[PDB]
Amino acid sequence: MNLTELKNTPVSELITLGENMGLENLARMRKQDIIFAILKQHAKSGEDIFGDGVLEILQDGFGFLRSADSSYLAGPDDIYVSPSQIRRFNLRTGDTISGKIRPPKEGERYFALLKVNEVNFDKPENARNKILFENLTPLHANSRLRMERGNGSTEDLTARVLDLASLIGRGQRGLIVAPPKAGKTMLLQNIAQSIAYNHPDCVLMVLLIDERPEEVTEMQRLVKGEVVASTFDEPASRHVQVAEMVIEKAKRLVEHKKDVIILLDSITRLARAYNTVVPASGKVLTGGVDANALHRPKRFFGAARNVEEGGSLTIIATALIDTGSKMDEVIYEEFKGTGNMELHLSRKIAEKRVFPAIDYNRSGTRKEELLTTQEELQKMWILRKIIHPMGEIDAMEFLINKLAMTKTNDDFFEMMKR
Amino acid sequence: MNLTELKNTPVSELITLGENMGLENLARMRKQDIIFAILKQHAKSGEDIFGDGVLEILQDGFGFLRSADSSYLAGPDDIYVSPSQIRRFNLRTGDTISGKIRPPKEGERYFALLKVNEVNFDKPENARNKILFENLTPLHANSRLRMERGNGSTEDLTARVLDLASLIGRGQRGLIVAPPKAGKTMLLQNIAQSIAYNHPDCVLMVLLIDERPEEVTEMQRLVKGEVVASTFDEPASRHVQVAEMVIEKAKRLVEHKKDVIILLDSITRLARAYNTVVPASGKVLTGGVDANALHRPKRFFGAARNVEEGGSLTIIATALIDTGSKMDEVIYEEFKGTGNMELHLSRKIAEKRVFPAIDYNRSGTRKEELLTTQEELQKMWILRKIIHPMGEIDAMEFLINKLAMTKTNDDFFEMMKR
Ligand SMILES: Nc1ncnc2c1ncn2[C@@H]1O[C@H](COP(=O)(O)OP(=O)(O)O)[C@@H](O)[C@H]1O
Ligand SMILES: Nc1ncnc2c1ncn2[C@@H]1O[C@H](COP(=O)(O)OP(=O)(O)O)[C@@H](O)[C@H]1O
Ligand SMILES: [Mg+2]
Ligand SMILES: [Mg+2]
């Protein structure tokens, strides 16, 4: 049987499956414990057992196949891979390994990988000869990711305003600058629907850091792609771990010429987690931010690029402002000019219960001429000139009215022309 | 007899009963000591002795049934539970066990459990087949907890303002941000009265950390549920132990499809106790707070959720500000955005002797559309639009003035519409 199918069943069915084959007292233990006990019980009978997971390599040399179902949390059901296997196949962290596994022997605590069947959704020989991510040439985004779905209404105005204000291309480095309760979470959710419906080919990953468990459940049940999260209950080490796990998996996928999109909420919380984890270097900036603490977060943000050889890595991360913590302000100030797309939300627009609370004038994209054609760019500059003189709330109200009058951004543009 | 009646008996009547049995020198020792002496003297007679308690499994394997009457304080009247019983009945910390108990034998210092009769207010065989707490998927609160009472005080008007300002649902994660002497204690008292009157089915728990003994007595004599408190003249380990017992018992009750509400005063004192207890990790934040120190309080505060499978855990904790202690502000900083509901008390409103001193414009609830109907939500949005331009002192003066002229919140909204 398969490990992923077991991890995808709810706890009740896992308990029933364990009980009807001989296991007992499975109800009160953790899901990973139930899965591990079921795996051992099935292995006692001797049938082939399959599994898969994203490889994480530890300092000692051996590695473990973490599962995205549990957001790459270490557990009894993790699959052990020996350094001999990590050297026989040239494997790095973030590699998606799928194959047969074997029960632990006397003196082993984890299931061990038996036969490698696929590496990064490809044969091991082909994945053996993939150029490393850092050897690829970054480029400006040139393939637009359209947000207008064309299937929804009465909230698709958010996607249409996104298309009017901030252009997202394959390989974009997007930063969403929003105060708390400004609508960033469901803005990301609507972006997720836009990406899933418009671009099924792109691999979509949603990364949540220090996020409430109920929102984690909503995001998981709501997004069609892969959602991994680390709640505020877990330590900053877990936030770090999931951050590198996601970024390494994305890099490995991009190495196979795949477009990978990562929605991050938030870069500020990840920066705080990194500041907590990394040792103090003796130089501490204002707000308690260690100077060296922001190196690793930026490396996460700087991985977003359009690869000339093939594929791309788009990263759209949210930045928190006006939260009352000056360390968040410092983190934002260190991440200001890093991204090439900016999307600003304002509390003033959100207070009047009018959404999306996008600050149209302060939002924009760099090198936007590559994403679209000349005439669409002319129409967008006409719209920019029209919107510019008037204030944030008036701009958003005007945009929402004119978009609600029409059905598509095109008809809105001819209506502006007329 | 049954131990619960003995522990709820006043000390004087306990002394008289023990003297009637034939004991002596009872008056001048601890209440637990008198209870233990009475239990031994009566068990010498030979008829059945009953007991109730909450299980706390020690690091050595065995456990102790504690009592909420003494706030789970270790004492001679604790019931001893062998690891064999923790294995035969699948038992965890926080389980409520009631059954026969037996006198200590030679070399035994505690009464020992003899026959397990009821676990978590259920038969032992049913309690072992309950899915563990963190195997249940969290959800947003959808069942509102009405604060407005049919009692009709008409001098306090706190529950009505709570309804007008911040909604509380089943599974809510609420945070009360208040300066000292602003009305925290009686705010929690009104919340507890509303919970007891409107929702008798919900299990109500009041958790007090570093609390003055007089207010512990007041809270016990006022709240109709369970009050477990730890005074400031006790070690931080005592506070931590009380918190773990309360949270584990709440989780075990939620596992039985029960709605459990915990009122905590305060999360700041609990964070200080955890910081004192936990070993230093080498990374100390501003204000002398260890990085890992806040990991365990969050696991408390993050345990609040609405369970899809049934039941919920609401936690309303008070956060303290303007105390002049950098530890307090930092604790507030890592607890700022972790709650669904926020309710802010203002010193300036309190010093005007107008109550409740709720900062209406800064208090609110996330996903409040899931707790009320569309019409009530529209009326509440209208009220927020009216109040938003006003200053918080003036806002509360206006709100109380308008509320006093009406009897119910619905009548208040109808008057506002007119
Ligand atoms: N595009 C939108 N349409 C309707 N309501 C919105 C929109 N954006 C935000 N809101 C409102 O804002 C509230 C909170 O938004 P949320 O996405 O949680 O922002 P944040 O993640 O910054 O807290 C929601 O209850 C929702 O009603
Ligand atoms: N809802 C209220 N109604 C009337 N008086 C209040 C109220 N809340 C606070 N007070 C006043 O505040 C004083 C103490 O409030 P308390 O509940 O001790 O606040 P805290 O717990 O923050 O010290 C009381 O003497 C009382 O006069
Ligand atoms: Mg959010
Ligand atoms: Mg008080």
Author numbering:
A (entry chain D), B (entry chain C): 1 to 418
Original paper wording:
Phage satellite P4 polarity suppression protein, Psu, a building block of the viral capsid, inhibits hexameric transcription termination factor, ρ, by presently unknown mechanisms. The ρ hexamer adopts an NTPase-inactive, washer-like, open-ring conformation until NTPs (preferentially ATP) are engaged and RNA is bound at the SBS, leading to ring closure and RNA entrapment inside the ring. Our cryogenic electron microscopy structures of ρ-Psu complexes show that Psu dimers clamp two inactive, open ρ rings and promote their expansion to higher-oligomeric states. ATPase, nucleotide binding and nucleic acid binding studies revealed that Psu hinders ρ ring closure and traps nucleotides in their binding pockets on ρ.
A ρ variant harboring a P167L substitution has been observed to bind Psu more tightly than wt ρ38,43. Incorporation of this additional ρP167L subunit leads to an interlocking of the two ρP167L rings, due to refolding and domain swapping of the central ρP167L subunits, most likely explaining the increased ρP167L-Psu affinity (Supplementary Discussion). Such refolding and domain-swapping in ρP167L only occurs in complex with Psu, as it is not observed in a cryoEM structure of isolated ρP167L. The final percentage of hydrolyzed ATP (reaction amplitude) was comparable for ρwt and ρP167L, but the ATP turnover rate of ρP167L was approximately doubled compared to ρwt. In the absence of Psu, ρwt and ρP167L exhibited similar Kd’s for mant-ATPγS (9.3 µM and 14.0 µM, respectively). The slightly lower mant-ATPγS affinity of ρP167L is due to a two-fold higher dissociation rate, which likely arises because the residue substitution renders the nucleotide-binding site more dynamic, as indicated by the lower thermal stability of ρP167L. The increased nucleotide dissociation constant may enable faster ATP turnover, consistent with the observed elevated ATPase rate of ρP167L compared to ρwt.
